[PDB]
Symmetry: D2
Subunit: 317 residues, 4 copies
Amino acid sequence: NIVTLTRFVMEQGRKARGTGEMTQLLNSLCTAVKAISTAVRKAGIAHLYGIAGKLDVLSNDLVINVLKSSFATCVLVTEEDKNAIIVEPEKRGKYVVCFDPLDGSSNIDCLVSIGTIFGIYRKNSTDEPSEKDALQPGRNLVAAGYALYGSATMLVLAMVNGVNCFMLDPAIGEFILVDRNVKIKKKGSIYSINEGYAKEFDPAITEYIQRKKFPPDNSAPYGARYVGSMVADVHRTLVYGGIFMYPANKKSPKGKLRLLYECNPMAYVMEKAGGLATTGKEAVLDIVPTDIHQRAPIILGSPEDVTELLEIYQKHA
Amino acid sequence: NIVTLTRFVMEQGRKARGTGEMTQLLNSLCTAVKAISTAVRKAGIAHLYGIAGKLDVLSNDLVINVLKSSFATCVLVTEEDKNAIIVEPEKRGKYVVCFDPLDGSSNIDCLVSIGTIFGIYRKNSTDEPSEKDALQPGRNLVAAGYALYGSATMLVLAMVNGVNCFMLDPAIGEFILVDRNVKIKKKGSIYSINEGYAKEFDPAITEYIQRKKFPPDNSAPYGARYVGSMVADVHRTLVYGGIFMYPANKKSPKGKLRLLYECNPMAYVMEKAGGLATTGKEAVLDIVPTDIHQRAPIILGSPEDVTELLEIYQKHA
Amino acid sequence: NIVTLTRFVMEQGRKARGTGEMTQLLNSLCTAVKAISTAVRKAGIAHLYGIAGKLDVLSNDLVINVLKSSFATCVLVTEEDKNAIIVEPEKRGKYVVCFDPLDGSSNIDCLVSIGTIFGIYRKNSTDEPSEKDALQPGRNLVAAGYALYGSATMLVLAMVNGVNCFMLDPAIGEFILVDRNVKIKKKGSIYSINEGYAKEFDPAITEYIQRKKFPPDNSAPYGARYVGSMVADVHRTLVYGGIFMYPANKKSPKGKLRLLYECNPMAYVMEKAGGLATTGKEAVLDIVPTDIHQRAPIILGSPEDVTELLEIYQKHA
Amino acid sequence: NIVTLTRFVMEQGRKARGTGEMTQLLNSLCTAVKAISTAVRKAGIAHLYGIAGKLDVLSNDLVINVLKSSFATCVLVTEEDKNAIIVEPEKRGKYVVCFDPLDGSSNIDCLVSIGTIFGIYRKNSTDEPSEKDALQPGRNLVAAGYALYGSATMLVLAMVNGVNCFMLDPAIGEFILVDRNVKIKKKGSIYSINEGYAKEFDPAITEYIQRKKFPPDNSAPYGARYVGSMVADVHRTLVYGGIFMYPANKKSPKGKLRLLYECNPMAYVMEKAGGLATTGKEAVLDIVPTDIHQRAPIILGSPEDVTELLEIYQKHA
Ligand SMILES: Nc1ncnc2c1ncn2[C@@H]1O[C@H](COP(=O)(O)O)[C@@H](O)[C@H]1O
Ligand SMILES: Nc1ncnc2c1ncn2[C@@H]1O[C@H](COP(=O)(O)O)[C@@H](O)[C@H]1O
Ligand SMILES: Nc1ncnc2c1ncn2[C@@H]1O[C@H](COP(=O)(O)O)[C@@H](O)[C@H]1O
Ligand SMILES: Nc1ncnc2c1ncn2[C@@H]1O[C@H](COP(=O)(O)O)[C@@H](O)[C@H]1O
Ligand SMILES: O=P(O)(O)OC[C@@H]1O[C@H](COP(=O)(O)O)[C@@H](O)[C@@H]1O
Ligand SMILES: O=P(O)(O)OC[C@@H]1O[C@H](COP(=O)(O)O)[C@@H](O)[C@@H]1O
Ligand SMILES: O=P(O)(O)OC[C@@H]1O[C@H](COP(=O)(O)O)[C@@H](O)[C@@H]1O
Ligand SMILES: O=P(O)(O)OC[C@@H]1O[C@H](COP(=O)(O)O)[C@@H](O)[C@@H]1O
Ligand SMILES: [Mn+2]
Ligand SMILES: [Mn+2]
Ligand SMILES: [Mn+2]
Ligand SMILES: [Mn+2]
Ligand SMILES: [Mn+2]
Ligand SMILES: [Mn+2]
Ligand SMILES: [Mn+2]
Ligand SMILES: [Mn+2]
């Protein structure tokens, strides 16, 4: 009585009486992620080193061809491509897929955890697909999730029904459901932010950080953690509780994280897990995108920690 | 032409005119690390999940068994064991090995990078082997290094002639030399410390951090990173540059990090790479331990960043 | 534009407007075969050998639990169980599955190729499932096939539409379609039989063998091949052409190979591939089984080679 | 406690007081075999099938490159190369290696067991290294063995002190000693020969086969097996007992099997295991080659079965 991703996706496609198109899509994603995982852990590297006489780019190509080979997509948006990819009408399905094929690429030389992030929208409208089809607020997401290539490979999938975590068994190449209907803690004890940007923080963030290090009610201070790869930082937030933040600063008054393929999927996982995701002023899932590579400030995590900071944001409002 | 860890170790052992006792020890280590890597990556997990027919305890058991069978060790010191382990006379060799089988174990549920740390001493006072044989300053290390299980598995080996990084190709189970004679940048641009302890930092540390966030000469502040796993943080330092800190505070008046199997091996690596590793008052390698599970304050990284901090310490002295 | 077993099975389930039950079944089989393949190639053997301090039986259990976990089966027949396994009504589906979890087990110590063989029937009737549900002639098979664990792992799947071959990529744990709509050669140049039973052969087999070694029309003689594992011998027959035979002798006047889980699936693959499978008197697929472990003589392969021998069988009739 | 090929080789090399030159050669071989095994098992095939972003030539290239880099060889002899390969003086060592990189290559499309065969000689006449250095009788082998890629990968190594089998654990890329000091049964019960050449067999062979099918003393006839891959057939002989035959016929008046890299290594293995290996007229190891691609008749296996056949030869002499 074990549950594999392949079994789960099919039973769910059956319960929802789908035509099987989304199921074929989710299966192609599962296959793409296993292929990326393998290249990340460097299997075959000996060949590059002459035993017999890129990564971001390879990841992009894998995700694109595998997704197109699903016959379930019409518009693809990648962090790696300036323009949205419109699918050939022969393989054109009804899904729009926004993804970051390998987030944290600059961490690669340091062997820090990296991941793949994706959000799926159903093409709403009836005209020649285009970038406009991806410009939907995150509230319209059919599914969203990410794959984390850390000490082990994990796929976290969020859909209307909830959040589920699947661990990859690289021996048989199968994702096994290990955490079902996940819920984030109401209050965590870790905060995550790049404090090297201190001089740039708005007063509300500055005050919050101060409350965490020197608690006014004399409670224990929060521990700090900042891996430097969103997928790793968010996954730790989801599993262990706490708050993650990447607010605005000189690096764009608009934030650094991209709305469509970084913030939205994460905000979606967070909300389905019972947490919050806000820009400080509004909920991330409610922002109407105007540009496929639009950035946005984001704060996510345990609801009590996010509301606490939202209050400070009010006090300074 | 390609260089595997197996060939390199043997070659070095040949140039050193060794009896091949250390070579066997190093081959054993390599075998232990590949085994731990496989377990960490979760191969075979489908079995726990009943496709019908603890990770730090297994790691401990693997290291101890694999090292004993090398017939090259007489005294073992593990983070996991209260007392030193004395090898049976039948299996005795002349080496003392101090290791942390799986560091960052708390981080396991969050899939954060973890690693194995080891330091190798040669038994000097030839009395019956005992705990006192491990009580040697790090300046007496013959070899030290670590294995990091991150996006990929890497083994860094440092010996008197320098530091070398080997990447694991899991397809053929062989470590390939990917970086020769490593040297750390003179000055970095990332500082790594758990700022959650700000309330308890000594003055020098407090001044240094603030200097990194608000540099006097209005230059770019240092970026910040803190994975919360020493091997991961120390490996990013060695490779990318910067400074790593785990100073003395209240919950740990002498630091959290253990001297024999965490601070020494890492300080040795740092020093052979041209970096510094201090306690704030003194070099970590010169400290003569008195207890095998002794703790010690540690600051390591690019020579200029560490020097700058040490000047500040002297200033408050 | 690559085709994985998972994609293929789903598109075919869609074309046939299935409810998705057979598809879930085929997916469970694919997963069982990858798990068996891994144990066959001995991954993890170091643990049996004490690195940190059956096969036929393990294969049976994997296939049974994985199949039951599909919720698509009601009656399971295994070469390893005296009695047919009736599925719990909770997980009871509509399919009857006959399989040999690991054929050629006595070859294991010699590392000869071995495999898994399976035939699927739709439960015809409407009463409490039982052994009687498996007692159908092979002509009623919905699907049949085998997995060969040889130099590489291959899954050959035969359905009403034809025969397809999928090679396993153990790096990503995915079967890739490599040979589509396979057809056996009309005439081969290799014959396969255990000639150690010469003294026991009926006159027709004896004459045929004689024609192959000393051709009366002076054509080149046929080469001989006899691996000793049916799956290996049949797979070579399917791919390279020729004839395979295991007629009756003192080892049962009834043959050695079992009808339900060895002969039928193979006869089915053969026929779908355009070849023949006969007992010498009748077509194997047409025999009405009377006992789940019933044996039967079998001759299969290229149609011209099988008809040639059938003629000799007539001459001696 | 467990024994890996790496430890065993080093230990043996220590007991022999070698300079570690042969040890490096043997470590190189091991690395080459693991690499070939991975390629044979088809890892990464999904790439040829365009998940978008010859096996005997690659094997040849792997062996040659990996052996050259060992700095232990001066002359290489491959089944795949017309002339011997002379290693650059910069990389010269004292050993001559004769190998078949991938034997049974015809069998690849049929997924039949294949293997690698090697024999190691020490350069004696110290003139400029040349082809003549490989022209040594097998009685002069320092080491020989083979790697079989069957249901699992095994490496059999024979040296003056005996024959040892190592099983590859692909999870950690390590060969584990699974069988120590192997010895073949005195008498077997399987004979292995391509009976398709019956029309061309000499009288002795013809009598022997018939004696196996119809034993005078009405005892059980020998079972027959003929995989068609020497390593597979010879490995079943060593492990299970019996006799393997590839006599002289018409299409091959001196046999098909080559002396230097097929017959010698296998005869050496057989002899250290307590078996016999003859040409019919003489022991294979005593033959002094005159051409590097020379062919030779071979009969090997249990000492009693081979003797019996040799008596029959003498009878027709
Ligand atoms: N595997 C599945 N899991 C959960 N919901 C599904 C699945 N397949 C389809 N659905 C749902 O049913 C809708 C239509 O399915 P489809 O016909 O495949 O496009 C989807 O957009 C989801 O809302
Ligand atoms: N593989 C090696 N790599 C580097 N140094 C070595 C190696 N083998 C031996 N040496 C050195 O030679 C000394 C004696 O080696 P041993 O006789 O094997 O105990 C060691 O303690 C090292 O200092
Ligand atoms: N994956 C599939 N491939 C080919 N035929 C299928 C598939 N699924 C179902 N069918 C066919 O449709 C019938 C009923 O499907 P099902 O509703 O799943 O039981 C099967 O028995 C086959 O005859
Ligand atoms: N690893 C080993 N295993 C068995 N015998 C060895 C080993 N190493 C060296 N010897 C033997 O010692 C001789 C010289 O070794 P070498 O100096 O390395 O060239 C060889 O030719 C073998 O006869
Ligand atoms: O390189 P990417 O693909 O844009 O992602 C890097 C991002 O960079 C953030 C960290 O940025 P700072 O270095 O500015 O903190 C992470 O949280 C995200 O992973
Ligand atoms: O779980 P361990 O073996 O004690 O290791 C955790 C150690 O803990 C340090 C961080 O601890 P803090 O949470 O106190 O910062 C790391 O740098 C070391 O990896
Ligand atoms: O051991 P199993 O599972 O019954 O299968 C062995 C069978 O045995 C046949 C060979 O039998 P002989 O040794 O009698 O030739 C093969 O063709 C089949 O694989
Ligand atoms: O393809 P190769 O390298 O020539 O090897 C085939 C050889 O051929 C022999 C069998 O050949 P026949 O078909 O003539 O029996 C085997 O025993 C050897 O493995
Ligand atoms: Mn990216
Ligand atoms: Mn990104
Ligand atoms: Mn530990
Ligand atoms: Mn530790
Ligand atoms: Mn069986
Ligand atoms: Mn069987
Ligand atoms: Mn060859
Ligand atoms: Mn050959």
